[PDB]
Amino acid sequence: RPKLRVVTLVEHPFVFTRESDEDGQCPAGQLCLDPGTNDSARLDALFAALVNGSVPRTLRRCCYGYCIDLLERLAEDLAFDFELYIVGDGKYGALRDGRWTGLVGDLLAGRAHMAVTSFSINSARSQVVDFTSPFFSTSLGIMVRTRGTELSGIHDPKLHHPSQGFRFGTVWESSAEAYIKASFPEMHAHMRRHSAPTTPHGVAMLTSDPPKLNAFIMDKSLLDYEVSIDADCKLLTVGKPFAIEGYGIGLPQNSPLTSNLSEFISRYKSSGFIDLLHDKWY
Template sequence: ATPVCRQSPFHFHMEQRSSLEMLVDVLVSVLQASGWQETNLVLCHPWDVSGFLGLWARRSQLFLRTVLDLGYLDEPGATHYLRQHGERFRALSSPVLVLGCDLRRARLIFQAAKESGLLLQEFHWVLGSPLSAGELQTEGLPLGLLAYGEVSRPPLELFVQDAVELVSRAIASAARVRPDLALLQTMVNCNDRRRAGGESSGLFLSRFMANTSFHGRTGLVRVENATLVRPEQQYRVWSLGRDSRGDPTWVTVGTWRRGSLELEEGAWQSHRQHKSPGEGPGGARVKLRVVTLVEHPFVFTREADEDGSCPAGQLCLDPGTNDSAVLDALFEELGAENGSVPRAYKKCCYGYCIDLLEKLAEDMPFDFELYIVGDGKYGAWKNGRWTGLVGDLLSGTAHMAVTSFSINSARSKVIDFTSPFFSTSLGILVRTKDTASPIGAFMWPLHWTMWVGIFVALHMTALFLTLYEWKSPYGMTPHGRNRMKIFSYSSALNLCYAILFGRTVSSKTPKCCTGRFLMNLWAIFCLLVLSSYTANLAAVMVGDKTFEELSGIHDPKLHHPSQGFRFGTVWESSAEEYIKKSFPEMHEYMRRYNVPTTP
């Protein structure tokens, strides 16, 4: 039998490789961090099993439930043994420590376990032999597998420098106590136990070397068991998971140094949750009821096919209710062979959140039933109860919700949220004016009352021009001096319109002084009107291409809205909850313009 640990033939030496005692300490720290009190052992190295079990008992309180020794079998023999003794695998329970196995032998063990009917994802597997970062592979290995290895090992030159410094420090310390023993000898033999006159210089110097420790170039340098110099070693613990694209990848979950394990909390919690909480007794997959809400681009819906299936996406129900009894009956009918669910209730849900749900169900794993929230709302505290998604979760109608669901303080007090998968913020959208101006856009520069006043004044001016001309002895009337032409009301209208629009047309001018004075007043009035119209027309045409400018949520236009200025948000959304809590007066004004959903 190969001993667990060989004794060095040298009395005093420095060792770079990890001792079996240290490897056991690392493994025990990892197992205890997972909360395990016992483990199963698959041994691939030809060690003395009884000696290893004794070492394990001395260094750990964990109970070894089952020991499967493959150390004396070659690769073909191990494969044959594993296939012939599948019941030994079926007797295993989680976790399983695979010790002394390289990756090739470990793959054989995983393959044999799979062939014997075990689901690898149902077990926690730990590779007990240290690996380097370059040796880590993912092919043929189960998700959730734990591995570890030494990192940041300094080069040999630094080890030699620390060894020389250790000897120098020991000699300096010994010289201060007995310079005659430490410095006067030209040759020192550490095996000399005694010499004439007392203790040998070699034994005297070895005592000082055994008690010397310092922080060198390789870290903390100290002497173990008075004979072994071991530099500080650091180990990295990895877990096999998935990256953002779903490909297997190794993730660092902790670091072991100076006898303690420092965990990466986020990655470690993700590793511990790898075994699905939805696994029921006997490994059965639990079926969860999931509620969603249509919100583009996270969740889309379309009509199901004629046979009620969804070639793409997930089949979901849209019954328009949150009654748990009704939903139970509908899903029971949906799962029955001859069940009939109204086709109007069947939808195909797809989108970013649905893809996340499918991936989550695959990784955890679990089955799910999907339906759309009955009232179409996210959830708010209203009339003494929660509505929408939050209400369905609190009432137990749904086990979880998957959609674009904003996290706020009120909701966080009653339900739990996962880590955000998409970060967003509230914003204000301003509607731009129509780019295609209507046919009556030329009248925009002046108010309609101004247009009415202008044309009323025009006709009144024409009327008075006619009256003045006919009452004057010099007017162009049948009774005036010039009887060949007559200045009628139509002549006055023609003159006033020509002056207003600035067009030179053939027109008759009044002959009396009063009429001419009134005509000049009308011309001055028309000049002022045209100047104002032209200036306003330019401003209106420029403003037609712009939008309402808002500086933010504290803009006076929002807090003191003018007549006709409208703004709103989605009913019972996180935005409405925020405005209701922070700006109650603004919320009171905008309530009439809120909409049930976004277009």
């Protein structure tokens, strides 16, 4: 069985992690490394150290979730083994200073055979890496606190001509930020001073004392999950859907794995297995 190196990004409910056991193993979930690096040699050395060195528990996690259940099914059906690490910079990927960051950057650099998480397909990314047929689809959405800001959607004048002290943001180096940069460049100029490194950081800005955002824009799939777990039910999503994109497994261009993964993904969709994962994890 070929052994594939898979990069991921922790984003609920697609990928969660818990601590490893006393021996740094995972009785539940799959062992994931948390290297914090995009240094190829360091990453190679860390995986090697699993077999002939000593990787401490501070760098081990056990991942689980919708995408991990999907990866396990694929490994079975396609007969491969895998090893996982969490992308060092915690980002999905953008082109910055001439290089791609995040998951996209690690695929291009040859640091992983595939990227598996809530990873959006867009035209810019598809030009440099390949994606399987999509396993999930989502609009972008807008999250606000209840009993406050009301918005019609991405065209609301509150977003195009913001009032004094009104603040909104997205997640750095996400596909949401890329869509806004391309479609609403003047809006992006406001947001980019008010955005967050991860989805949870952006949701926390809505809830801080005092709040640092009045609205937060991100994949509606992800925002819906955060609404569902808020302890006070004080978050909600507002406005019309926009910027629909598929989630896919990312691979370097011309990978011999892509077609075979797509064929299984299509079968999981039609058979109900993809819907089962949604019901399990939401």
